[PDB]
């Protein structure tokens, strides 16, 4: 269960580090995965994009994306918010979204 409080700021890179041992390469791949997860168009098209990012194998990444696509992106953006402005923006756009609102309510409760 990918709980709202489960994902941390570095959790996206940490999970992505199971397959990539090179920290710099792992960080670059995690940032690319985030940039693909955000600004997403189609389930299969973004799945193919994630395949191009992290190989045809390692289907666990695609499974995690299917289980948490908006959840992962929103949690990573909010947790990795450098200052109060980014946190305010993320929480504001998560208040409008129903799933994100429930995610935040569970996270703070």
């Amino acid at each position: 269960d990918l709980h709202p409080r489960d994902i941390d700021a570095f959790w996206l890179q940490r999970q992505l580090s199971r397959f990539y041992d090179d920290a710099i390469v792992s960080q670059k791949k995690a940032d690319e995965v985030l940039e693909i997860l955000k600004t997403a168009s189609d389930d299969r098209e973004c799945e193919n994009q994630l395949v191009l990012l992290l190989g045809f194998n390692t289907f666990d990444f695609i499974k995690v994306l299917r289980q948490h696509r908006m959840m992962i992106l929103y949690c990573t953006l909010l947790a990795s918010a450098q200052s109060e402005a980014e946190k305010e923006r993320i929480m504001g756009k998560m208040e409008a979204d129903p799933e994100l609102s429930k995610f935040l309510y569970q996270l703070h409760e």
Binding site: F10, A23, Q27, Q82, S83
Partner: protein, 456 residues
Amino acid sequence: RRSRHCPYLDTINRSVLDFDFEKLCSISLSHINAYACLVCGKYFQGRGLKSHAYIHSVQFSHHVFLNLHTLKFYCLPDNYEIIDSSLEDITYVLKPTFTKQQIANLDKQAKLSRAYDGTTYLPGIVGLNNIKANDYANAVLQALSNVPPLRNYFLEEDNYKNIKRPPGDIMFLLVQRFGELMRKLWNPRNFKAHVSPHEMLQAVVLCSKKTFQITKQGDGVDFLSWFLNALHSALGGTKKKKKTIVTDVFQGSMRIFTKKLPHPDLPAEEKEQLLHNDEYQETMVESTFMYLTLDLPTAPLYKDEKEQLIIPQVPLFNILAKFNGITEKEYKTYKENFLKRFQLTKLPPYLIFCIKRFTKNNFFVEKNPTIVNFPITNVDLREYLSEEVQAVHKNTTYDLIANIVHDGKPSEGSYRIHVLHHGTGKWYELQDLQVTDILPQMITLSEAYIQIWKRR
């Protein structure tokens, strides 16, 4: 330059970081220029090449270290300080700092503070690990930390950092270590759900001359008295400033209108001679009663028609009425019958009462099991105060804030604390490391030993 883009920061193990014990290096065993590892868990020394930290980072691949004094996260192998605000939790847990307003919103504790681990909790209701027989000291510390005066005073390092203590004094550690424990026990975002009293208990053991150590348990009343005296003598600095935080928050004034008896084996004339020659005179010796030792009556050691339970109950009002002016008490001094009588001149804001439920028999040391039927909602000592200044004390409606009960046999006994938490109304009972919920009616059931009441 390399900050804000550190890849190694994604490997910090928040679960293993425990900054409660002493802040020393792994190999160096030096307290200077320490730098704990945010991945390897342990703490090393140095912050650069040819230092223990760089070697430990290179060898163990743990490439993230934070300085315990500079409070900065740096990549020790690369000597490039990192900059990520998402890591502020580690700094907050290491150095808990309470804001000017956050140190006064302790009564507005609505949401439960969930630790970084998988355990929701509430600040203040936290357990101190029972390192060997540290139960008495842990209970006394967890009860003294409940009082908002002392907690607020110790939550601001500025209130004690500039204290002018002698350079060659070790007692200043007690005023310094207790502050760290109080700050950690009130951390709203602590990494763990409990704080280890190891540092504070070790300091208490060192600053007490082999008394009240962590190995052998001690008396809770004696430990509380010693800690209060040490805090009062440590809060003041380079002067006889009796107006300490502890002396102002938990010490009051009692006027003992005490007297003495002439002789039991003398006739009327010889007794009256001493009664008139000021040899059996009544005098006022008013002192500062930091703790009011309300003595419980010995168990009758005999059953009766009533009292289906064979535990002799006793009302708090009758117990506390002894300190009143009318109630006279006798002291069996050497070659004298010191028949005295006390009177509370002034009540402290947070009265601390410690019922001496344990005595010494002619061949052993028994513990009186009489219960103290003390209402824990409202009570007034104006019915036992001194008649001279009865109307001077505007507020007298005191309510019990924390009770520490020493259950079990005298030799092998457990020390449990039943504390009435603020913010909410639940009077939680805390074990050494277990936090439970106690019904208010059940609080007045367990035989209390030390009680602290807030005068409101």
